[model samples]
Target chain A: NLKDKILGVAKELFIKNGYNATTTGEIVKLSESSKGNLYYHFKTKENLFLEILNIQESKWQEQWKKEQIKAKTNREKFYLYNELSLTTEYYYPLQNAIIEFYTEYYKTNSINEKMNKLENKYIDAYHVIFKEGNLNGEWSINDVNAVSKIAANAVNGIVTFTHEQNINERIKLMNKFSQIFLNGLS
Target chain B: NLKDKILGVAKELFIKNGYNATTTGEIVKLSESSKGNLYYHFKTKENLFLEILNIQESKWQEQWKKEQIKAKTNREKFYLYNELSLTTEYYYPLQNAIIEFYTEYYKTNSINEKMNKLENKYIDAYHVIFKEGNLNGEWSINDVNAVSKIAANAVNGIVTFTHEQNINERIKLMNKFSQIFLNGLS
Candidate 1:
């Protein structure tokens, strides 16, 4: 249907212009669809934008799931997760929008349950890997929960810095952070 | 006197409304200072705002120096640096203004060298601790520059997350991050 088409075009526009700058009419125009068709799928502009985020998040989750299946051990799983985080497509507009949206909503407005769920899901998955590794004697994570949270935070910080500054420098820093995390976990 | 008053008011306003939302007239009114007086001290509104940032940055440096003196061992010094980061007095307002200013500057313009210099100063101080620790054989930092940058970024991420969510959670994450970093050096 036009719904999927609208969402696809909206995602591109949002990624290009950021959530605040992107307009609904632009989405419709880019999609080569009518305004009525766009409105029929989503109630408001925010809902349409949120749907785009949801789709992006879903793709992220799916890729993570695939990585989990391919990894034979916790160490491999950790490396895959780290690589995926470091290599996440650098979409400055989208990243900025997400940071701003999160800063505002998570701080001032109602909590975004979906976003929290996604974050917590990844954290929990990492914890599971650590637990498995500990049982197998491949790794010895003293505090899986704390380490998961810290690793997640470090990955996030490195990503944000990479977007904000020298990309190559951030890449180096990310590698350093990953190695340090590995040393600590090992 | 008028300049100090204006700066004081501007600092408060910048903290409350961020660098972009704050206006010159509001600073004038808040300080009960005239436009001519402000112009006498600083030629432009941007100049005045940046002056406030510089003052805050100096204060941060001063505090870090004091912390360094009180710190006995290299490990303690490194730990104190991270704890110093958790000190909200200097970090919160500065972070708010910086995030807003950098977001706007990156989107529409480039950040000024003055801001970069202030950030680099913090990194330089961190390197001092790392170098000292390495010489003392208390830490084993592979690349002080890389680790310092990542550690700073990690701390910023933790603080920003705390600003959004749970402060205790952020502290816990910071501790874990520090443990990993320390392990890398050890």
Candidate 2:
């Protein structure tokens, strides 16, 4: 219970003030937990940050699976994926902090491994979608792996850049991306 | 002469060893310049890095404009753009270092402004291409701005991810992406 409370409060602080600005003292104070309790749960602030990322990652994975089951076609799934990504509460607030963490801690072996695992999960998800599309004759891509990589990267780009643009513009651009990807696949 | 020499060496060091890893002492040693001379040329290492980016940015602009003149049609120009991007000598080596600079110094006002200006230049170039396509009836898309953003972002995605992949695979993926853009536009 204390661990969950710490995570909840730390996540809010990290999102609001970012990783470097949010101090351990603030997290401990906000969570109403002792410094000993916090350290007992997480060895360091970085450890706590990684735990939060893991939690959000699994939440996204579960949500994506649920959405995938409802979509019948590859095209629909692509739209759904983009829609979920853009609309997710976790994505917008946590993305900058996560990027900060990755860029700052990427040289560390444990952080690098965790980052790679998270990246691979997205790539693998896209790979499965492309493979299924090819099997069903929906798309005739020769290298599903390459296509998956491109798709994942493109989606990431869309998410990163479309933040400043208006909602209507964002939606329209997303639609065009979906159409381009579908047409290319077919 | 000394400033240009410093920039040249700094560029290489930043690219090879990264922004944080490459120190001013190493830069001065590599460039055969004194610390005072380096300081005279660049107020700080950050200034030197931004200058390198600005130089590269202009080179790319000039190169893109020259290529645009050689291209006969909108579709031809689009492919040419992608082709040059993939085949360019400057893009691959400089990308990682440039990204490092942005992530580290993004909060600095001067750095942030310079980065936005550089980004806007590319987006403007894409917008012009898409507008030409629509005027020439090459593509039926009504939203040129939206299409341009998507197209630029997609190409960026391809370039960023395709580095470790083989040449053939990169070319193949580029072709697929180009086809998708052409299809979506038409």
Winning model by TM-score: 1
Alpha-carbon local distance difference test for all models = 0.69, 0.74
Worst 10-residue lDDT window, candidate 2 chain B: B91-100
Candidate 1 residue spans exceeding 4 A from truth:
A1-51, A64-73, A90-95, A107-112, B1-3, B28-48, B68-70, B87-91, B162-165
Worst 10 residues of 1 chain B by lDDT: B104-113
iRMS values for every prediction: 2.3, 3.2
* Candidates 1 onward: DockQ, in order: 0.47, 0.35
The recovered share of true contacts, given per candidate in order, is: 0.55, 0.49
**What's the distance in Å from true for residue A160, model 2?**
4.5
Instruction: List the pairs of residues colliding in candidate 2.
Output: none
Clashes of each: 1, 0
Question: Candidate 1, residue A70: CA error in Å?
Answer: 8.2
For the second chain of model 1, what is the TM-score against the true structure's chain B? 0.81
Candidate 2 lDDT tens digits, B1-94: 7567778888887776666668889988877767777466476678788778778767887888876777899888888887677777663456
Sorted into a CAPRI-style docking class, model 1 comes out as acceptable
